[PDB]
Ligand binder design. Sequence first.
Ligand code: MG
Ligand code: MG
Ligand code: MG
Ligand code: MG
Ligand code: MG
Ligand code: MG
Ligand code: MG
Ligand code: MG
Ligand code: MG
Ligand code: MG
Ligand code: MG
Ligand code: MG
Ligand code: MG
Ligand code: MG
Lengths: 145, 261, 63, 178
Amino acid sequence: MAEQTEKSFLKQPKVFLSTKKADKAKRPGKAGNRFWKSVGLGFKTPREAIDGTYIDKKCPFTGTVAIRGRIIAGTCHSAKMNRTIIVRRNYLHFVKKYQRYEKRHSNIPAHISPCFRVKEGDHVIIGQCRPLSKTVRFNVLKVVP
Amino acid sequence: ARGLKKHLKRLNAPSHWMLDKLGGAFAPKPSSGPHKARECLPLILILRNRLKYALTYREVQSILMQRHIMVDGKVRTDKTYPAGFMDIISIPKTGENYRLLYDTKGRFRLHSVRDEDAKFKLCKVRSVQFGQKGIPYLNTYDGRTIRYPDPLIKANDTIKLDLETNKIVDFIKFDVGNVVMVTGGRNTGRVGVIKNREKHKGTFETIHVEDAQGHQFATRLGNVFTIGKGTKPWVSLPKGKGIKLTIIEEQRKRDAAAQAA
Amino acid sequence: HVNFYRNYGKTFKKPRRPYEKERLDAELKLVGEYGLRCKRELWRVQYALSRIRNAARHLLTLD
Amino acid sequence: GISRDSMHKRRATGGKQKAWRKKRKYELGRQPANTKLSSNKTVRRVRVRGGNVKWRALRLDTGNFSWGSEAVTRKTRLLDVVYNSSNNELVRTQTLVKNAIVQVDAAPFKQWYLTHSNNVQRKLEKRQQGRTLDSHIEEQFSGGRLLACISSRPGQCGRADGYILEGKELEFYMRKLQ
RNA sequence: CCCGUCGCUCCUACCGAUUGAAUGGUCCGGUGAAGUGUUCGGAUCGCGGCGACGGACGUCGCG
RNA sequence: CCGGCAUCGCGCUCCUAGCCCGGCAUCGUUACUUUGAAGAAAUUAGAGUGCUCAAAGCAAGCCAUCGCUCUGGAUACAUUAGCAUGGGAUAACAUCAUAGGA
RNA sequence: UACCUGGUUGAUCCUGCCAGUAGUCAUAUGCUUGUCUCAAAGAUUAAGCCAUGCAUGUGCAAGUAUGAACCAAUUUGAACUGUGAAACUGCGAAUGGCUCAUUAAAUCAGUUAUAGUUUGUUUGAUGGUACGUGCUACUCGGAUAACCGUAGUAAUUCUAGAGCUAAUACGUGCAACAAACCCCGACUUCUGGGAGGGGCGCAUUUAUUAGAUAAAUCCGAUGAUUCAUGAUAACUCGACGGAUCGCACGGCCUUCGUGCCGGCGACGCAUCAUUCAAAUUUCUGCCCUAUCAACUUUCGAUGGUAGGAUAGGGGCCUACCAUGGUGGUGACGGGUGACGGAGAAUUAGGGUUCGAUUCCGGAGAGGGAGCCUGAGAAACGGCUAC
Ligand SMILES: [Mg+2]
Ligand SMILES: [Mg+2]
Ligand SMILES: [Mg+2]
Ligand SMILES: [Mg+2]
Ligand SMILES: [Mg+2]
Ligand SMILES: [Mg+2]
Ligand SMILES: [Mg+2]
Ligand SMILES: [Mg+2]
Ligand SMILES: [Mg+2]
Ligand SMILES: [Mg+2]
Ligand SMILES: [Mg+2]
Ligand SMILES: [Mg+2]
Ligand SMILES: [Mg+2]
Ligand SMILES: [Mg+2]
């Protein structure tokens, strides 16, 4: 459909689509149903991920990646990549001699599941996963515009 | 390094072994076993250091090659064997039996027990789950794996294990209201009673404990080890009944004990 | 090489001002009256005293 | 030799990265197997970390293929590779990798479907109540072969295993083979 | 009291025609030892079938 | 010095839940501060102890200094970052006039 | 000890530096040197070069002793007995020791993660089917050292050929059911049935399927999983599933036959868990320099899909596609007479400077590069090449 735009047919692992005795209430990812999961740590699975048609191996809610480690919160800084954003963390670093502060920042790449929509400069909550690319080790879980 | 390390330099040895810093360049380096080598007490220290049954390295070996020392029911001739918390060390030749328990200062002590209370130990369960062919089995925190447990025993609980029959004989359900002896951190040695448990999704669970003499403290789940059901514990306590005290309390203890002498 | 781990320390300290008559005479008074062999014996007593006084002052600062 | 460390890479800033180390053996890679599809089967063992073994298959001829909706898996032959989504030159070289598209003799499947006295017919008749067998599979059968996808790593486990395409997947690869 | 030019003695640095000189690295182009993987190869070495043939022989059994 | 209430204290099914009753959890975030956990030893500070003193060391001391007794081998500091707990003055950043409010 | 003093003037009060004054677990050098305890010592320049010697080998009752021995010595079946050298087999040599050249978000420290992996060994638990047409196990190989003997070469733990002989070396090779369930399926009666009888340990790989609510007979785990785990269909030219070794004896006959047994141990195979660890990995933190403002990107620079490779995640690498990524909050470059930390010196407080060196982590073995063995090495008291 809209997802099948690449040189190979993209599908979720371990869901048998051409099932014989199908159903609408067995379990997520059983009898042909699209698979989804709840990440945990008090986050809620977006409805657009639940009844979604996108296929994303790296999505927190429908893909194979697990969220574990740190939970950082920041603001979106760049959304000009395919399914990946750069977020800014702004923080205060203490300068001990002068007993004062200075403003520092860090750029964190994070994978953005198609179930979200991000402008530039939205509040994002990202959670850590296994390395997904050279620089990405975090996944977007919440977006507040 | 291109492989495993086999020496333990004396300054890097655990602080609760109380090894003196000029007594050589190396420390015994506990061999792999049922305890994590930073929370164990090798046989070299049990014989040579604490019990003063031997004066040198080689005397400990002369003791062990003769099959006197028995650890938890089997004879262990390895010299750096990692004996640990709640193990039993038995010398039948002298007919003497010790349970390894903590003292309030965080150091292992050999508490003498009777022969009745040496055929059993307690052990905390690491987890329970299925194995090959659907068989359920539980993990302890000292290596033992038991198959076909009571289907109620869940993780973090305690079990009594007879050394003779090697199976379970009773268990304690980890929960609020039981006595627990702390096995890590600064509070190791202190017994107490579980008063509160607060969960935190994605981090360590923390336990809030209250001593019998009123002092209140806290630790994390991994460092708590239940001893008994209810306020009564199932096993003997050492010279102090697991009650921490301030430095001023023991200063008073020394000076008050200095008037009768 | 163990035995490198044995501690050792300094017990005295020389005066900041080498030649001042007042301190010179005050120190010689003690070196004579108590039959000490040299100034170092007086200075190590002073250094031990200064240690115990710093400890006392710190404890007095607290509540 | 071939290596899997990040040292030769440039930093994310694009700054060059100085060499502070030599290459470590726990970082190695090996050259690929590019398993050809040919009769003279050859699978050659590899000693890998931990003392374990991987089976590098250099040349395979038969395979194990599952037909999902019918819940049967049978050994068969591989006749050709027709489409590879990574590189066409792999197709031109008849190289087997995971997710390649292959044609399969399908006769063992046909003979299973030939199956499915009195009690025997009172079971053929129990079945055939749910016979669907969408025409897309039927046409391929009359052709003699089935389109299949490899679901194993021949250069890793030394085998060519897979499934027959069905439904959305089958029709997608059909329109791509056009 | 004091300024500068010029002359003498010592010192320090600067520019500099001279494709000045030496030296190490880097990039691109080429040549490329040796190892590792692979394709052939096959000295000889193994049931040395067999014809039931007279230690040989070759058809060999595959390694 | 503080708990526990009451004035004109936005709620609870679910955990703790007194004999109809305090003290319940998500529908703004931080800095700051308080307390705790987890923090290698050696070094530093520091408790004990007459190596003859000291620099040290981690010992030793009593027994009738007779078939062994009592033992010790504390405690603390650890900026910044990370985890958790109470406070909500001070100061940030986000924001009730489209009522799309409860 | 929260401290100052000499010096610009004819004299004054200042600014301001110079000089003094003290320390250094700080190096050298000079003069001197009686006792006791203590203990740094080719780091700095040359991570420059090395004669010679030594630094890693190893035996239990428990792998293999007529190859030649010592010591018993046999009554001359039966032992090479008791004790062994040598040699095969196994294991270890990947730890320790030394140094600080390279290395400035690198290493490293605190703090995370593996639901992203490997792990000889220790410890606990565990283990049927090998073919028999699953109807209780189905047979024993050759060849090599120590030795013996003929040599080569100037030469070396350089080497060729011949005669012997072992195994826990090497190579074959018996297999424990109800088959529990699953698919076939001659006939029976009509099936919802009965069914005679052929194909189904543990690993490998793939696929399908199960793995349970919500208040008016659901039943393991996590913060979170298509999880643990079970069933099913197949696959593989399967690493595997004991042809081994020590003493001890000691009940009882079925041929009274080392007779039926039966123990305590050693070593070894495979799986899980544990322990001993490693590898990757999250957040924050590092000196001077702008007379270093743009850098990276064709040739991987940032991301996406599918693969290949790896123990495993990942542009790690390949193909295709998108145009990103870092930067005055200092990127990129340059200097470092820069390994990081614990720590050191001086310290009223705040600070300043140092940290080659015995503990932790990293890195290297003349410079690069490539490897074999192995659980573990990109090893150098291992190899190959320059
Ligand atoms: Mg080393
Ligand atoms: Mg050891
Ligand atoms: Mg001052
Ligand atoms: Mg003047
Ligand atoms: Mg004058
Ligand atoms: Mg000066
Ligand atoms: Mg990619
Ligand atoms: Mg991938
Ligand atoms: Mg350097
Ligand atoms: Mg140097
Ligand atoms: Mg070191
Ligand atoms: Mg090295
Ligand atoms: Mg050299
Ligand atoms: Mg090397």
